[PDB]
Design a binder for these strands. Structure first.
Lengths: 313, 307, 306, 317, 305, 314
DNA sequence: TGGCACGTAGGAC
DNA sequence: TCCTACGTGCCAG
């Protein structure tokens, strides 16, 4: 009878390594998510911020985004979003890139209760606040619990880093946020879905690889978005599907001998499309490795000229 | 029987001297024109480029632009625009700020024939080409000549620097452009209107002061936009109205004695809106004048110990 | 006090001109060094044939220099004698060992090392040909003299001694004076035994240099010695053999189905892909080529005798 | 002269080359190199660009490696930054084999890309790559067009290469003179003769071999002189005028054409006037050779063709 | 002794700082003063390494003093050698060098010549100032001097150049360019430079007066003038070179930022032997002060920083 | 003969580099050397030099060499020489020395009285440097003083380097009625030869020893440039005892090519030249490429190219 | 597939 | 001890 989608951090207009393809890659994954969300036809979409990677984004990005959310709004898919750190203006009167979406999307800085088919469910959220103004934020938070006391199904949307989930730096401690059904969170790039405070908390995570860091979280957790049904009285991990998204592949290498070299080539060969290769290569192998420059998108590996006696036990 | 509007170089999102107020001024004047254009209800609007001052403009700017041109298209006013230098992409696949308007506006890089009451008139245009590609442009232009052979009323839109009109540097020599009724030109910030090639040529000029230069061209000729009628078969200067727009006035100073100071104070008094002051003021007088910092927007003056 | 006796690593040996075989030598060498680093002895005695040639592969020199650097940085004193393969031939030609002069003591005389907390004597000299034996004897007889007044005295040599390697040898077993420990090199098999009021050792090659030592590696195990010399006396009891995993060789004699299955069984139980050698009847060669994936290199003679 | 910046262009010392299998020749190569190094040290340049073939072989003689490491240690201990690109002789052949240049990793920068050297008080871009063969020229071009790109916003830009460029070495070349982008200085290597001349809005140089590797370069050493270049690169502009060529005294080759008493006495005297027992080559008439065989002691090695033909050839003027 | 000679250079005759009679005079008298002392010394040879005159077409007075000087020197059977400095080298072909006016007293060197001293045999060679542009030319010239001097016991080389370690920008020769000679009689450099070099001894005699605003204190520590070499014995060391100093015009620096530096500056000027040129810094607040005290001084001119 | 003779010479203008040509600078040097060569052949008793030896106050070294090498020959042959400063040899700045000063060891620079005792007689000489009009008054007293010291002398010679009124209209510093009665007037400033009886005696300008201007090209043709040789053996001096020794020097041809006659007339004038001449004057635009054919035969072309069509029909 | 270079083994003085 | 010939591993085109 009901379902909705949790997505965040598409980072529209990100140009990794100043490469054309990476900027395209970001766009493609975003669209790919959108194509599925239209296939899914959820009743609501929760967007946890950083839709755009910058405050004054590429024209191409706003184009893609505006056409995207328009397509959703035209299919009776309700959408909510909170401002990520990148979409929050710095000068007084500077407008958010999210402001270009006012006709397709509800920007949240308070409470709202959505009457869905066929029920009534509560949403609250607020834009990205800094560490500096946490006290400010707590007052906001206790007030959200207050207006949500008498609601069965209550959702919190935030774009902040929570203490256990991201060591440094965080703006919130896991004990700061009151009891809610679903914690639609954003700021963190890796998938985080686990039971929490008599309910269930999630970070949808970034929809493409933003750093050389998350290379294998896509391998083991996979990047994309969550699809929560929220039909029944309870919500558990069991009623949350993670929809994964194909994105630009990264193969790590550590070429130090004949084995590691061939292991590197083979990894690159089974790539569907030219991968970002990174890690380390011993000098002796680098000219040999330059033979794959056609099969590789961009090589971002450190060249080691030391001869190491490193031996495994 | 018919009328239309020529406007260009609004430079939306220009933030002169990194002043909040200056970014506002540009925004306001654009809006002011739009309100007047809506009062007028012209049949067509020609915009010759540099609508935005950058490729990636402020978000407020893009909203104002979209809302403005939306309002125009919803009052069934047809709109044409050509890319200025600032709206031209640099990377292959980087898109123009003008691309965000494709639903209200026809972006021109070719021919189109507009049906008005009760006649038929030809329009062509192309984006800003660089000097480097002058020869390129000529093929384009010589071809527009060809497509316009059998048309009575013909308008060309361009955003370039033309030879007599802007000495160095220009992209076209004034003998480059074919015979057309109206020359909707852009790249130049001062008003330029004069008869030309069995027809009439115009630069609409910036809709606000983009440089410390045009401070008095607004005073002496006035900035704004043109309103050409083209009602009759022929068109001369007598059928072009120039609409002026209140915008930020600049006062020049050269305070080296009591005369130049007090007389300067008087000019500021006679300014309707708080002016940008520039020129020279002797060091001795600067603390004296800083008491008057409330009636002035920003003080941009040289400190002189000499004269 | 403790010290390490090692020799004949033969760095840069490329058996059958295989990439992996040159590696084998490298790795086992790297492994001994790794083991020598955990142990932390006060001294390491290297008895020569560190390198297999005068102009060794570049990789070998880099590994070698890096190795003894790591030792020198852990305050491990190192002594070495020139092996036969590290001896220059043209006048003014240099030894690869010269590339180690900043990490290693090259020995051609006496030295007295002050350890915590003692004082102990070492002497040695480079590889001599059989030809110049008489020359060598004064060196030893003079070593005899310079070591008389020392409790603990060690002799380092890289030669073949008569009982220990029948033909050919450069020294006779009655040629060497009384020393505590005889840290020797030139021979590839392990040789440790009591001798002349002390104890004599050949560390033996740290990898398989010939199809010969394939099983001497099985029963004695290849690697290096760890002598403590903590006490005033030293016996066999204070000498540890640290072994080294190295490339296995399997011998075959395929003339019927019997030998075939047992040969396969020997190959399957191999931890590391083996070098196979010996004899195979021609009728069996296409059959044996099916086993090419589990094998490194086939060096077997194809005989169609019958 | 000065400066805010200076550098040294050197290449092709071919350490460990043993011409005619002579001991004296292997020394000769070593000594010439040492001399360059000694001179580089009195000069105290801010940078040294070495364009490859430092070692004559992939697995060099130990003395060569010893000399090389001691040499570049000496440069590095005097805060002289050094860059090198792999010559053809220093390119590994089996996969995992290391270059002898790798023994220098602590004293020298091995170049296969861009780098910005910050000198007092300025900023200058360096790029280079190891030796590529003709076979993979396309591969090389992508790189070069990419070097053009990363150096566009740079005032002073240097390219290091160890290749043969088309006009400069007819057969065989790996690159055409129109392949290389505009750079201030072209630090080139593969060629043994000195070549310094303006090129593509900048200046191209081959430092050339620091010794006579073939009986061929015998006179290119006489008129052009073998050694290395010292470019100052002080100003925004660079011309030949800011390049000193330091020559290096090395083993002499005397050419002979002994056909009469004129040529014989002139050959003996040219040989007598030699500092070191010279390599003699050319032609000698059979009639003269036993007479010439007295000088084998005054001569390092005789590589002359013995002609028994009687020419009645007569000169005009 | 039995034998001696003189190394001198860079007098820059006719340098007329700020178009003053008094400055050129300092140059003229100090020059003669060297000559007088050279007349006390009576050496067998005098070596002049160039820039005798500051220009190619010098004032007439300079040429008067020059010939008058070398006349008396040459009349006392004193052998004299000279090489052309940068300032004495022709630019137009057929223009003559001012040194040509001395051909009756002096041997101008562009090659070898052998001096007979009592009672021995010693080799001299030298060449004019070559530009950097033509260094290669110079080396061959030098490689040839080495050749002709091999079989000579005591050998002297004369040059007017800047050598690389000794003068960074710009130099024409690298110190490893010049062959082995006993004494390196060098010129182009204005400061005294004497040190052992290439199994012998190299010298820049240095300017005989202050030609630039720089040498005000270099003259203080090393002293300006010329060297006096004996060369009697087989070897030559620094120990066999006497340096004769020459009295010349003093320069005083000031830095008035308070009364402290102010009075100390005034007092330091007072201990001057000859009417000094005053320069340095004075705070605007202080400027009228010395202009009241300007009468006891020849020229008042300070840098405004 | 003779028993007694002496030489009057002036205005060599040493180091003059006309049209900045080497050959022209050389020409001046050469003509001067030739005069000295002839003078040494003659072996006269005295040489009077009337100034402008050098063309500038700071002359080229080459000039000073030639001058000094020359006067050495004179002074070494016991010929005493007198000179007065020309306009080009008079200092401007106080303490600046005259280029003539480099000669104080061979030559007497005159600014007063001196009596030369010749074998076997006695004759009075006076002279002074070049004065401008400005100090004519100055000059008059000097002259009244010279006349005074010479009253009791039979033979008295005046040396001067000025322009005298009839002989050079504008501008002159002295009037011909200014100079007192002397035997011989050894004068300088003028480039043309001037010899004539004057004030109970004889006046002379030796004239330039080469062509200093495009002007004197033909005063040389008809009068000839060089120097005078005065004998002064007897008590009286007349024209008959003065030989003018001429000096062959660099030729100048004037042209006026406006038609075929004038073209051909110019070409022949150039052909008849011993040495490549300095050509000057006017050439019509119409004729110039034809005239460019003689550039080999010509030292330098310094002629105006007229592109005007003149109806000049006189 | 040809080289190409290293390594292995038989031989000469 | 040298060197030769030969077989052969491994990158080449």
């Amino acid at each position: 009878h009901m379902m909705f989608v949790h997505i965040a951090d598409n980072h529209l207009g990100y140009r990794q390594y100043n490469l054309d393809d990476r900027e395209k890659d970001i766009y493609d994954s975003f669209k790919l998510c959108i194509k599925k969300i239209l296939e899914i036809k959820p009743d609501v979409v929760l967007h946890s911020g950083d839709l755009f990677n910058d405050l004054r984004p590429p024209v191409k990005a706003l184009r893609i985004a505006m056409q995207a959310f328009k397509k959703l709004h035209e299919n009776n898919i309700k959408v909510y979003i909170v401002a990520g750190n990148h979409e929050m203006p710095r000068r007084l009167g500077e407008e958010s890139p999210l402001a270009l979406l006012k006709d397709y999307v509800k920007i949240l800085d308070g409470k709202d209760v959505i009457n869905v088919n066929g029920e009534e469910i509560f949403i609250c959220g607020t834009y990205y606040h800094k560490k500096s103004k946490r006290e400010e934020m707590l007052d906001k938070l206790k007030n959200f619990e207050s207006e949500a006391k008498n609601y069965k199904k209550k959702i919190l949307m935030l774009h902040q880093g929570i203490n256990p989930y991201i060591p440094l730096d965080y703006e919130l401690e896991h004990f700061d946020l009151p009891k809610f059904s679903y914690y639609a969170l954003g700021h963190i790039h890796k998938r985080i879905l686990e039971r929490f405070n008599d309910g269930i908390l999630a970070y949808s995570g970034s929809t493409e690889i933003i750093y050389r860091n998350e290379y294998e979280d896509y391998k083991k957790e996979g990047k994309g978005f969550y699809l929560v049904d929220f039909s029944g009285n309870d919500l558990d991990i069991s009623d949350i599907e993670k929809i994964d998204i194909e994105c630009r592949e990264f193969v790590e290498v550590n070429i130090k001998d004949k084995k590691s070299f061939n292991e590197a080539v083979n990894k690159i060969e089974r790539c569907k499309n030219k991968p970002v290769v990174f890690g380390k290569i011993k000098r002796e192998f680098k000219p040999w490795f330059d033979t794959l420059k056609d099969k590789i998108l961009i090589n971002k590996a450190i060249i080691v000229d030391d001869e190491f006696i490193d031996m495994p036990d």
